[PDB]
C-alpha cells in the first residue's frame, strides 16, 4: 500500500505511522498496571465488566458473515467498550489527530476512531484496548511533553507551550521533573489522581521531534513545499467536483 | 504596515506575538477577570434570593488556568471580554435578530388593483398617505372601526410602524415623506438606479410588527399581524364595509399573494414557522446587513460586516440556542468578527486578486479557484504558524478552518464576480487545511466540507442551488457552526467586487435601509460594541407597566 | 357487491346513459376510470418552458422579486423546445412506448408531461412526477446548450426554484394539481390539496364536469384517510353517485325545476317532495301544524340532502353568475333543511360548519380569500368530509367574472396542460363509461 | 439494454444463483421483487391488540405518561382476538380474494396486517395503511363488545393516540415501517424514513439480508427522488448491485480475505488491488514513489470502492461485535481511499461528510443517538445517496448487545410482524431470484 503522497520527512512519517508492517519506535516501558491506571476505567485486579454475556452463551442464527470475521478477544468475552484520548501540540508533536485515525484503522482491528481538533480518540473492547493502549503509549505515538492523555477538558493543542516545553493542560495530568528532566503522569486520563505517578520517560530533544513529527509548519517543513502532496489534495478536490456535476 | 491583528494579539498577552512559550497556572482562575467576578457575585445572590445552589465557580473544572482573554471587536477599538458578546449578554445582538424577526415585506399592489377594480375607487399619493396615517395608528394595535375596543400602550409598541418605497420617484416624492424609504436618499447614485429599476413603479410596504410582541411569540407571527392591521387600515381609509366578499383578496394578498418573509418555514425535524433564523437564506441575510450601501468602495469591508451578521445570528442565536442551547457558540461566531484577523486575511486575498486578475476579470473556472484558494490558504495558515499568539487566540480548529476558508473562498470571488466558484474556493480550503495541520474542526465540522466539492456544482434535487439561493436549511448546512455566516459573506462577496447594489432580492436590501429600526444595519460590528458594553437601547422592556 | 343499491347514470346534459348500476361500480375502489384519473393526477406535470427561459435570461430566480446579478443566461429553449422535449422524455420513460407522454403546447412555450405509471408502483408517493420531469428537463437543457459546469446550477434554480432551502419548490417553472407531502393537514389529505380554481381550470368551467372531479378527488381522499371504510362506506358512495355524479338526474332535474326563479328554499322545498314520494323520508309524527319526519335510511337522506345542496349552489350562484355567496348556500341550505324537516343536514351538520367558517374566512380581514382559493386541505374547508368544497368548484365554474382571484389569475399553466386531457376535462363520461363497462362485476 | 453491465448474483452463503444478470434486472423501475417488497412496506401494519387492550385497561392513552381517571374500559380483546380480526379484514380487504392479509401472532397478542394493493392504486401516498387498518380495527373493537357511543372514543385514542391534536399518531398501538407524509425532509424521501433498527429486527440480524433491504430501501428512494434519472442512473444501478446485493461475490470475498485478522486498511488494500486487476482503474501517473490511478468509468470504481466500504464495516464492527464504529469506518474508508489511490471516495466525498457528522452525532451532547436510531432521512445521514444506511445495517446486525437503543429497545413490534413476511426477511434471496427470471427480457 501507498498511504499518502509526498517527499518530504512529515510525508514519510505519516505513511509509517499508517504502514502496519513499519515497527513504531519504542521510547519508554510501561508496566500493564500503568497503563491500567493511566486509562482508568479498573482498578488492578478488578475483573472485567461486561456489557453482555460471551458470544459463546449466546445462540446466534447462521450469519456467513459473522462465521468469517473473528472478533477481538474483548468481544469474544464481551467487555464494555471504553477509550483513549490523546491531544498533540502543534508545536511539533510526533503524532496529530487524522495521522492517529487514518493508522489506527490500518493497524487495530474492531476500532472506533474519531477525531478533532483538539484531541483524538479510539474506542474498542476493554481488554484489546489496553493492549493497544501500551503500545500508543510506549512508542513514537507519543511524547509526554507535546502529546497528553486526556479523556476531558483537552484544550492545549493550539497553545504556547510552558517554560519546560510542556504542553498546557487544564488539569496537570503530566507534570515535568525538573530534577530527573522525566515527565510523570500523576493522574488518570480523566484527571483523578494517581497513589503512585507513572514514568514517561524524558521529553523527545527538539531535534528528535522535528525528525520525527507528521505536522507541516512554516518552521519546519512547509505543506505548500511538499508540490507533490498539494497536487493530490487539488486532485481529489477537482475530481470530486466533476463527478457531483456529471460524473465526468 | 503591521498586520491588521498585532495590536489585538499585544493587548492580550504580555509576550510578544511571536514568543513561543509562556507560563500558566498563576492567574487565580477566575480570579483573573472581572466579568467572571462579576458572575460569582451574582450567583451568590441569585442562589440566596432563590433558595437554589446556581452560578459557582467550583462547579466542574477551574476556568483560567490561561489567560482569559480580551477581544477587539473588528473594524472598532473596543476590547471585551468574549462573555459580553454572548448574545444572552448583548441587547445589540438581541435586537439585530428582533429587527429582523419582526419584519415583513408586503406590496400593495394586488391591494390597489381590488381598490380599482373591485371597489372601483381610485388610488393616488393623497390616498396612499391616508392609508399610511391609519395603518401607523393601527399596526402597533389600536382601533380603527369598532366601538368599546381595548388597545395596546403606544410607548409599549413604539417601535412598530409602516413605510413605503417605490421605484417612481416622482410618486414616492408625493407620498408623505414620514412613511417613504427614500431609496435615492439612502442609496449612491448606481446602487439607487440600479434598486428602482428593480422596483418600477411597484409600491411596497415594509411593516415592523412590535418587539414586545415578537419576543412574546414568534416570527411567523408577523406576516399575520402585518396582514390584520393593513386589512383594517384599508377598511377604515377607502371607507369600506367592515367586512365584505372584497375584504378577503385583501387578506389573501396580504398574507399570502404579495408578502415576502425574511424567512421560509422548515421541515419537522427542526420545526419552526416563517421570520426564524433558519429560513432566512445567504442572499437574504447579505441584502438585510446594509453594509453595501455605505462602504460601497471597499468589497472587504462589506463582505466581512455580512459574516459578522450571519456568524452571530447563525452560530450564536440560531444553531447555539434555536437548535442548541447553554453556553453556546460565541466564540465560534466571534473568531470571524474579533481581532481583525478575517481581516487581515481577506485584505490579502482581495490584494492578490487584484494584482493578478483584477476585481471580476478572473476566468470563472476551476483554475481561478485552485490559484487563489490556495494562494490565500496558504497565507491564513502561516499567520498562525508564525504569530504563537494568534494560535493560542484562535484556539479552537473550527474558528481557524471557518476563517482561513471565508479569507479563501471570498478571495475566489472577489476573483470570478461569481459565489458559486467562492464556494468552491471554501470546500479547497478545508481539503488544504486539513491536510497542512493533520487537524480541521470539530468531530463534525466537515459534514459539509466533505460533501462540499461535489454539491457546489450539482444539479440534483436536494443538492444542486446557487449559493445566494442556499441557507441554514440547505441539507448539508442545517446542522454545525462555523459555516453560514462565512456562506453568507461569500454571497455578498463577488456583489461587492461588482459594485450591485444587491445579492438576491432587492426588495429586502431597500426594506433595511430605515434609521428608524432599533438595530443599526450599516455598523453591525460597531452595534455588537455597543451592546457588549451595555450601552444599546432595546426596544420590547416591559419597565413601564411593571413596578419601579 | 357489498351493498344492494343501483343507480342510474345519465350524462351531463341530463340525458340517460346507463340504468340501475350497482352503486359500488362507482366506487375509487372498483371504477377503473377514477382509478386512471387519479394515477393521471398523481403522474401529470405542467412544464413552464417560456417561464424557465425567461427566468435563466434575467437570473430572476428562488422565488417573488429574487435575483442574482451576474448570472444571467440566455439560452433558446423555447427554439429548440422539441429536442429538448425529446431527451427529457428519453429520461423521464422506463421502456420505450411505454405510457409516458411529453408533449409540447403553445409553440413550444409549455409542455404536458405525464409520467410513466410504473414510477409510481415503486414510489411511496407522487413526488417523482416533479421530481423526474424537473431533472430531466435540467439535464436535458444543460445538454442542449452544453451549459458549463460552472453556470448549470442556475438552470435548476429557474426550473425547481429555491428548493431544497425551501421546503416548496419555491419559485419553481413547473406545476402540479398536487402540492408537497409536508403541507397535508393530515395523513391521507394529498388528492384534498387541490385548489379549487385548478379543478375549474382543467374542466373548463363545465359545471357538471367541474362538481364530478372535485367529488371524485374528495370522496376519493375519504377512503384513503379511512373515512369511507366500514360503517361509513355506503354514506361516502351515495354521497359520491347523487352530489357528484348526478345519479338518477336528481341534481339536473331540481336545477331544471328552480333554475328560472328558483332559490335556495324552493331548491329544499322540492328535495323534500322527492324525498318524501321516493320513499326516502316519511312523516313520524305530528306537532301543531308541524311534520316531524324521519327516515329508516339515513345515508340516502343523506345523500339527496347532498343534490339538493349542489342543486341550491347551482341556482343561488348561478343566478347571480358571482361565486361567493356559496359559503351562504352552504350554510343556509343545510340550517333551513333542518328546521324544515326534523332531520340532520347534509354530513350530520359538518357542511353547515364548514360553511360558517368559509363564510367568515371569505369575507373578512383574517385569512382565507375568495372561494377559488379554498381546497379540502384547507383549514378552512377541510371538515366535511367531500360534501362541501364540489360545490364550491361548480360555484367558481359558474362565476363570469367577479373574483380577483380567479382560475385565470391563478391557474394558467395548470389550465393550459391540465385540461388537455380528456379524462380530466370530462371525468363525467369517464367515470360513467367505465361504472356501465363494469356493472356485471360488481 | 440501456446499459450492457452484467453482472453475477450469488446467495447469503456466497454460492453463485444466476450469472450474468443484465444490471437493470436489478432495477427498482423493472424487478418485480422490488417492487413486492415497496408495496408491501407501504402496505404493512403491525396491530398490537394486547397494547389496545391495557391501554383501555388502565386509560392510558395519548401519549407518554398520559392518562385519563375515569375513562377505564375492560374489554377482552386479546381473547377474542379471532373474532376481531376476521371482523377488521372484511373492512380493510376491497373483494373477498384479494390481497389482504390479516394473521394473529403471538395468541392473539398482535396481528399482522397486509392492507390491500389496489387501495394504494387509486390512492396519492401510503397512510391509508394505518388508517384504513386503524378505523378497521376500532370499528371491530366496538361492534365486538357492543361499546356504547359515549365510550368508543376511548377506542379511538387506544388505536391510534392523539391525532390529530398531534400530527403523529401520538400513543398509538399500530406500527408501519414508514412514517407519516409530513416528517419528510424532501419530497419523495418516505422510503429514507424507516429506522436502521427497524430493517435489523425484520432481518432477524442477518447481515447480508438487512445490507440488502437497507439498499433496496435507499436506491429505490434515489429513483423516487429522481437522484437516478438520467446521467446518474447506472451509478445507482451499480451500487445497489455491488454495495448491497454482493454482485460479484465482491463483498463476501473482500470479508472471507479479511475476517481473519483482517482491518480497515487491508479491505482497502484487497479492493485497490481487485479493481486494478478487473480493469476498473490503472495508473495514470507516477509522482516520486507513489501512483496516480485513473479510471474510465468513475461509476464503476464507485461501486468496487462502496463494495469495499460495506466489507470493511463488516471487517470493522464485526471484529468488535459493536456497531458503533461504523461511523468511524464510513469515515476512514474513504479518507484512506483517496490518499492511497488519487481517486475520490465513495459517492464523491458524500459518505465521507456523512460519516462525519454521524460520528459527532453518536460521540456527542448536541443529538443523534446510537446508530440504529439513524436512517435516510435522518437530517444528520440523509447526504449520501444510499452509499451510507446499508453499512449502518450491517453493523448493527452485527452488534452483540452494546447499545441501549437496540433494535429489541426501539422495534420489538416491527420485529414480531415484519419478519413473518419472507420478502421482507430474506429480500436477497427474492431480489436475486426475480432479477434471474427477468434477465432476457432486459
Ligand atoms: C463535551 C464536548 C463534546 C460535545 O459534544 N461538546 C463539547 C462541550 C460543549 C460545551 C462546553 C461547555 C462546558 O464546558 O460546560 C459547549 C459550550 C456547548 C454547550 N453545551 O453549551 C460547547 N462544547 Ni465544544 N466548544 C468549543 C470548541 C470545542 C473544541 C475545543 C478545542 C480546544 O483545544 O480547546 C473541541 C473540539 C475540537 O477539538 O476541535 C470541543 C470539544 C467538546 N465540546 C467536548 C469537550 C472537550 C473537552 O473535554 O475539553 N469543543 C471550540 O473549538 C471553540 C468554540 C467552543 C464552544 C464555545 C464558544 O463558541 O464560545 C464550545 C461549545
Ligand atoms: C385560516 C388561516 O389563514 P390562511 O387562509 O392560511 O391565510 C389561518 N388563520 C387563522 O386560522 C386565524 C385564526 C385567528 C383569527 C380569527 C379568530 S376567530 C392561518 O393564518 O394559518
Ligand atoms: C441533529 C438533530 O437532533 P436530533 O438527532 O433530531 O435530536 C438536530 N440538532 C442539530 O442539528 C443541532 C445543531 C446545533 C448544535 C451542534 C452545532 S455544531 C435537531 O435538534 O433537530
Ligand atoms: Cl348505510
Ligand atoms: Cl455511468
Ligand atoms: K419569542
Ligand atoms: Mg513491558
Ligand atoms: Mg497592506
Ligand atoms: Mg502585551
Ligand atoms: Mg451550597
Ligand atoms: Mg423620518
Ligand atoms: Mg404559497
Ligand atoms: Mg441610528
Ligand atoms: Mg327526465
Ligand atoms: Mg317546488
Ligand atoms: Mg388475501
Ligand atoms: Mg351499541
Ligand atoms: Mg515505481
Ligand atoms: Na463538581
Ligand atoms: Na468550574
Redesign the interface.
Given at each position: 500500500a501507498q498511504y499518502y503522497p509526498g517527499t518530504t520527512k512529515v510525508a514519510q512519517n505519516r505513511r509509517n505511522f499508517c504502514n502496519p508492517e513499519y515497527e513504531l519506535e519504542k521510547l519508554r516501558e510501561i508496566s500493564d498496571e500503568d497503563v491500567v491506571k493511566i486509562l482508568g476505567h479498573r482498578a488492578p485486579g478488578e475483573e472485567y465488566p461486561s456489557v453482555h454475556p460471551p458470544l459463546e452463551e449466546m445462540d446466534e442464527p447462521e450469519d456467513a458473515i459473522r462465521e468469517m470475521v473473528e472478533p477481538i478477544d474483548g468481544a469474544k468475552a464481551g467487555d464494555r467498550v471504553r477509550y483513549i484520548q490523546f491531544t498533540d501540540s502543534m508545536y511539533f508533536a510526533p503524532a496529530q489527530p487524522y495521522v492517529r485515525s487514518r493508522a489506527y484503522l490500518c493497524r487495530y482491528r474492531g476500532a472506533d476512531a474519531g477525531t478533532l481538533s483538539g484531541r483524538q480518540i479510539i474506542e474498542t473492547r476493554e481488554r484489546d484496548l489496553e493492549k493497544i493502549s501500551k503500545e500508543l503509549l510506549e512508542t513514537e505515538f507519543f511524547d509526554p511533553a507535546r502529546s497528553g492523555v486526556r479523556g476531558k477538558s483537552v484544550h492545549g493543542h493550539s497553545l504556547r507551550l510552558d517554560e519546560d516545553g510542556m504542553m498546557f493542560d487544564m488539569l496537570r495530568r503530566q507534570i515535568y521533573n525538573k530534577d530527573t528532566g522525566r515527565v510523570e503522569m500523576v493522574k488518570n486520563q480523566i484527571g483523578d489522581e494517581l497513589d503512585e505517578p507513572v514514568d514517561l520517560g524524558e521529553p523527545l530533544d527538539e531535534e528528535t521531534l522535528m525528525e520525527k513529527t507528521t505536522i507541516y509548519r512554516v518552521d519546519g517543513e512547509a505543506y505548500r513545499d511538499d508540490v507533490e502532496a498539494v497536487e493530490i489534495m487539488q486532485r481529489i478536490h477537482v475530481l470530486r467536483?466533476?463527478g457531483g456535476?456529471?460524473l465526468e | 504596515a503591521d498586520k491588521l491583528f498585532i495590536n489585538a494579539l499585544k493587548k492580550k498577552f504580555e509576550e510578544s506575538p511571536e514568543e513561543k512559550k509562556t507560563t500558566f497556572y498563576t492567574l487565580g482562575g477566575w480570579k483573573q477577570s472581572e466579568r467572571k467576578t462579576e458572575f460569582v457575585n451574582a450567583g451568590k445572590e441569585v442562589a440566596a434570593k432563590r433558595g437554589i445552589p446556581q452560578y459557582n465557580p467550583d462547579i466542574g473544572t477551574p476556568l483560567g488556568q490561561r489567560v482569559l482573554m480580551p477581544y477587539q471587536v473588528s473594524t472598532t477599538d473596543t476590547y471585551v471580554e468574549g462573555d459580553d458578546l454572548h448574545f444572552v449578554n448583548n441587547a445589540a445582538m438581541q435586537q439585530m435578530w428582533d429587527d429582523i424577526r419582526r419584519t415583513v415585506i408586503v406590496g400593495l399592489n394586488?391591494a390597489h388593483?381590488?381598490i380599482e377594480?373591485?371597489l372601483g375607487k381610485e388610488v393616488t399619493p393623497e390616498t396612499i398617505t391616508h392609508y399610511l396615517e391609519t395603518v401607523n395608528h393601527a399596526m402597533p394595535g389600536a382601533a380603527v372601526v369598532q366601538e368599546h375596543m381595548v388597545e395596546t400602550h403606544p410607548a409599549l409598541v413604539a417601535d412598530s410602524y409602516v413605510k413605503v418605497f417605490t421605484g417612481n420617484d416622482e410618486i414616492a416624492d408625493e407620498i408623505d415623506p414620514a412613511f417613504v424609504i427614500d431609496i435615492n436618499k439612502q442609496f449612491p447614485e448606481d446602487q439607487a438606479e440600479?434598486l428602482k429599476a428593480?422596483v418600477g413603479d411597484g409600491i411596497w410596504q415594509v411593516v415592523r410588527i412590535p418587539t414586545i410582541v415578537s419576543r412574546t411569540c414568534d416570527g411567523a407571527t408577523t406576516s399575520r399581524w402585518s396582514?390584520?392591521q393593513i386589512?383594517?387600515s384599508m377598511?377604515s381609509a377607502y371607507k369600506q364595509a367592515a367586512?365584505?366578499?372584497a ?6 394578498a396580504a398574507?399570502?399573494?404579495?408578502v415576502?418573509h425574511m424567512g ?5 425535524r427542526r420545526a419552526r414557522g416563517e421570520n426564524e433564523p433558519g429560513?432566512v437564506?445567504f442572499?437574504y441575510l447579505a441584502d438585510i446587513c446594509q453594509s453595501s450601501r455605505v462602504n460601497y468602495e471597499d468589497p472587504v469591508r462589506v463582505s466581512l460586516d455580512v459574516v459578522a451578521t450571519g456568524a452571530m445570528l447563525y452560530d450564536q442565536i440560531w444553531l447555539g440556542s434555536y437548535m442548541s442551547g447553554g453556553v453556546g457558540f460565541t466564540q465560534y461566531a466571534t473568531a470571524a468578527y474579533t481581532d481583525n484577523i478575517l481581516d487581515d486575511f481577506t485584505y490579502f486575498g482581495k490584494e492578490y486578486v487584484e494584482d493578478k486578475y483584477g476585481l471580476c476579470e478572473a476566468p470563472?473556472?476551476m483554475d481561478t479557484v485552485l490559484d487563489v484558494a490556495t494562494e490565500v490558504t496558504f497565507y491564513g495558515l502561516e499567520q498562525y504558524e508564525e504569530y504563537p499568539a494568534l494560535l493560542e487566540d484562535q484556539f479552537g480548529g473550527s474558528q481557524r478552518a471557518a476563517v482561513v476558508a471565508a479569507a479563501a473562498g471570498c478571495s475566489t470571488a472577489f476573483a470570478t ?5 467562492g464556494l468552491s474556493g471554501w470546500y479547497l480550503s478545508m481539503y488544504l487545511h486539513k491536510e497542512q495541520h493533520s487537524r480541521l474542526g470539530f468531530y463534525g465540522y466537515d459534514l459539509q466540507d466533505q460533501c462540499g466539492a461535489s454539491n457546489v ?6 443538492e444542486?442551488?446557487?449559493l445566494?439561493?442556499?441557507?441554514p436549511?440547505?441539507?448539508n448546512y442545517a446542522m454545525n457552526v462555523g459555516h453560514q455566516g462565512e456562506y453568507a459573506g461569500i454571497s455578498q462577496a463577488?456583489?461587492a467586487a461588482?459594485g450591485?447594489a ?6 429586502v436590501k431597500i426594506a433595511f435601509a430605515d434609521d428608524n429600526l432599533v438595530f443599526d444595519f450599516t455598523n453591525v460590528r460597531g452595534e455588537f460594541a455597543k451592546g457588549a458594553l451595555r450601552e444599546f437601547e432595546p426596544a420590547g422592556e416591559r419597565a413601564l407597566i411593571t413596578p419601579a | 357487491a357489498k351493498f344492494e343499491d343501483k343507480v342510474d347514470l345519465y350524462d351531463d346534459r341530463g340525458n340517460l346513459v346507463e340504468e340501475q348500476v350497482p352503486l359500488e361500480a362507482l366506487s375509487?375502489?372498483?371504477n377503473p376510470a377514477?382509478?386512471s384519473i387519479?394515477?393521471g393526477i398523481?403522474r401529470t406535470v405542467a412544464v413552464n418552458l417560456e417561464g424557465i427561459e425567461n427566468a435563466l435570461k434575467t437570473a430572476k430566480?428562488?422565488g ?8 444571467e443566461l440566455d439560452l433558446d429553449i423555447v427554439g429548440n423546445a422539441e429536442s429538448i422535449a425529446a431527451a427529457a422524455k428519453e429520461?423521464?420513460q422506463?421502456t420505450e412506448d411505454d405510457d409516458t407522454n411529453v408533449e409540447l403546447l403553445g409553440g413550444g412555450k409549455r409542455a404536458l408531461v405525464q409520467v410513466p405509471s410504473?414510477?409510481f ?8 412526477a416533479?421530481?423526474?420531469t424537473?431533472?430531466?428537463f435540467?439535464?436535458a437543457i444543460?445538454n442542449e446548450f452544453d451549459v458549463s459546469?460552472?453556470d ?6 429557474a426550473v425547481?426554484g ?7 419548490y419555491?419559485g419553481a417553472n413547473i406545476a402540479t394539481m398536487?402540492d408537497?407531502?409536508?403541507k397535508?393537514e393530515?395523513?391521507?389529505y394529498?388528492?384534498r390539496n387541490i385548489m379549487v380554481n385548478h379543478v375549474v381550470a382543467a374542466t373548463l368551467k363545465n359545471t357538471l364536469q367541474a362538481a364530478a372531479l372535485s367529488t371524485i378527488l374528495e370522496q376519493?381522499?375519504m ?5 369511507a371504510?366500514?360503517?361509513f362506506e355506503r354514506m361516502h358512495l351515495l354521497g359520491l353517485a347523487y352530489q357528484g355524479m348526478n345519479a338518477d338526474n336528481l341534481v339536473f332535474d331540481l336545477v331544471k325545476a328552480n333554475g328560472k326563479e328558483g332559490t335556495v328554499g324552493s331548491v329544499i322545498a322540492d328535495l323534500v317532495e322527492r324525498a318524501l314520494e321516493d320513499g326516502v323520508i316519511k312523516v313520524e309524527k305530528e306537532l301543531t301544524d308541524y311534520k316531524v319526519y324521519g327516515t329508516d335510511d339515513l345515508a340516502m337522506w343523506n345523500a339527496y340532502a347532498a343534490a339538493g345542496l349542489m342543486a341550491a349552489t347551482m341556482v343561488n350562484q348561478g343566478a347571480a353568475r358571482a361565486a361567493?355567496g356559496v359559503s351562504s348556500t352552504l350554510l343556509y341550505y343545510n340550517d333551513l333543511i333542518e328546521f324544515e324537516t326534523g332531520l340532520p343536514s347534509v354530513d350530520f351538520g359538518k357542511v353547515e360548519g364548514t360553511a360558517v367558517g368559509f363564510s367568515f ?10 372561494p377559488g382559493?379554498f381546497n379540502g386541505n384547507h383549514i378552512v374547508t377541510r371538515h366535511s368530509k367531500g360534501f362541501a368544497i364540489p360545490c364550491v368548484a361548480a360555484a367558481m365554474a359558474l362565476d363570469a367574472g367577479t373574483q380577483?382571484?380567479s382560475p385565470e389569475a391563478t391557474s394558467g399553466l395548470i389550465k393550459e396542460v391540465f385540461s388537455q386531457v380528456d379524462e380530466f376535462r370530462e371525468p363525467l363520461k369517464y367515470v360513467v363509461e367505465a361504472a356501465a363497462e363494469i356493472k356485471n362485476e360488481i
Open positions: 467536483s466533476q456535476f456529471n | 394586488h388593483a381590488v377594480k373591485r440600479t428593480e396582514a390584520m386589512g383594517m377598511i367586512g365584505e366578499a375584504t378577503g383578496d385583501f387578506a389573501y398574507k399570502h399573494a404579495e415576502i421560509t418555514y422548515l421541515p419537522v429560513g437564506p442572499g470563472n473556472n464576480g461569481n459565489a458559486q466558484t456544482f450539482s444539479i440534483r434535487g436536494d444542486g442551488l446557487p445566494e439561493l442556499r441557507g436549511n440547505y441539507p463577488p456583489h461588482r450591485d444587491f445579492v438576491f432580492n432587492p426588495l | 375509487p375502489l372498483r377514477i382509478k387519479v394515477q398523481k430566480v428562488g417573488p422579486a429574487c435575483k442574482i446579478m451576474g448570472r429520461m423521464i422506463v410504473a414510477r408502483d415503486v414510489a411511496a408517493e407522487y413526488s417523482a416533479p421530481l423526474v424537473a431533472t430531466a435540467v439535464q444543460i459546469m460552472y448549470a446550477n442556475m438552470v435548476k434554480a425547481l429555491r428548493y431544497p432551502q425551501s421546503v416548496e419555491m398536487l408537497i407531502p409536508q397535508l393530515g395523513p391521507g394529498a388528492l376519493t381522499a377512503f384513503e384517510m379511512g373515512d371504510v366500514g360503517a361567493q374566512f371569505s369575507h373578512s380581514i383574517y385569512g382565507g380569500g375568495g382559493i380577483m382571484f
